């Protein structure tokens, strides 16, 4: 039955309902500079992930506590959000998801951690350094900019041996 | 509105909805089934065909200039329908019978804007896009 064709596809990029609205438009460029996003499709990709994380909580809030569908899902909601760190582990609240920040998903993005930890010190520098394979999570080198790391293992972010950390001996064109 | 409301009245409401559904011009357009037979295009984005006599339709008001269009017989339904040419001076390329694709005017039936009595719009001539012919992007 064409077995290798069987698969699934996703729509992280969801465009908004009215495009040319000045406030939404201005914020886009403002956010684009803040976290150093190369494409504008990603901010909407973030909006889709944010909404799913917002609805689960609204439906969960309307359920009474300790209702099994509520209790298991609530602990689940907290577990994933606490791993992300956008929800402070201390908050520990199913209702605490509401009032969520898009900036916090952006903060979770590993590209952001590199700027904050002064590993590259700039978002523009951060993307370029990751492009040149210069930041490794737990040593697993990633060249895709949005590695997105859980906060539980944020302390394990590391630099790369090729030309940033303790040079392996490969300085780009300078080597030759 | 009187409205008939009772626990056992799913009959009045079912017939009424079915009969009063076909009152809208838009509903009847897609639900009578006349539109697929009636449209020159058989409900398609584009139709191939051969070009026939060119035409110079006077505009209405405010627009006050002749807009050159070409009448083409669509091969599939063997019917002759006119198609508005694209950008400035783009009709000179089109002369004798040549392969022409025609597309909707957005409205889907009504004539576009204020150029009266034209329902369809040409999109191609020969084997090259007619909006590239205008820009000399792709031309004979």
């Amino acid at each position: 039955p064409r077995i290798s064709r069987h698969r699934n596809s996703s729509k992280t990029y969801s465009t908004p309902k009215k495009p040319f609205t000045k406030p939404r438009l201005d914020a886009e460029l403002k956010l684009c500079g803040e976290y150093g996003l190369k494409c504008k499709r990603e901010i909407y990709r973030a909006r889709y992930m944010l909404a799913k994380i917002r609805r689960t909580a609204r439906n969960l809030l309307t359920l009474d506590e300790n209702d099994i569908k509520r209790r298991f899902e609530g602990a689940a909601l907290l577990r994933r959000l606490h791993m992300l760190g956008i929800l402070d582990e201390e908050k520990d609240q199913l209702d605490y998801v509401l009032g969520l920040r898009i900036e916090d998903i952006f903060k979770r993005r590993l590209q952001s951690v590199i700027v904050e930890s002064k590993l590259a010190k700039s978002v523009h520098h951060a993307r370029n350094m990751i492009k040149a394979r210069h930041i490794s999570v737990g040593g697993q080198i990633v060249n895709i900019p949005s590695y997105m790391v859980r906060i539980s293992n944020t302390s394990r972010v590391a630099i790369a041996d090729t030309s940033s950390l303790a040079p392996n001996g490969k300085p780009g064109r300078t080597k030759r | 509105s009187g409205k008939t409301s009772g626990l056992y009245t799913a009959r009045k409401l079912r017939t009424i909805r079915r009969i009063q559904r076909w009152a809208d011009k838009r509903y009847r357009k897609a639900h009578l089934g006349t539109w697929l037979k009636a449209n020159p295009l058989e409900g398609a984005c584009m139709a191939r065909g051969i070009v026939t006599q060119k035409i110079g339709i006077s505009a209405k008001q405010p627009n006050s200039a002749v807009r050159k269009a070409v009448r083409v017989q669509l091969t599939k339904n063997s019917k002759k329908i006119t198609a508005f040419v694209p950008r400035d001076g783009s009709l000179t390329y089109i002369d004798n019978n040549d392969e022409v694709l025609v597309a909707g005017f957005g409205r889907a039936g009504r004539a576009v804007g204020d150029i009266p009595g034209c329902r369809f719009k040409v999109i191609k001539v020969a084997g090259i896009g007619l909006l590239a012919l205008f820009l000399r992007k792709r031309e004979k």
Partner: protein, 67 residues
Amino acid sequence: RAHGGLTSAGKVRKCTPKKEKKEKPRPPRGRAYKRLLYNKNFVDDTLIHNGRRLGPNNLLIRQKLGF
């Protein structure tokens, strides 16, 4: 009467003076273009905001910017 019509063939369209693009290199597209936009339209003091926001295609930004 002979107001015009099919005999007229884009007389203005062919009569536009032949023109070419002013010589210029390529500001790189992507976040670099986004950063150029982040500066051109955001922060950067009076460059985009002389007094109240002038406007991106404004005549006042022009000439001060250069052209």
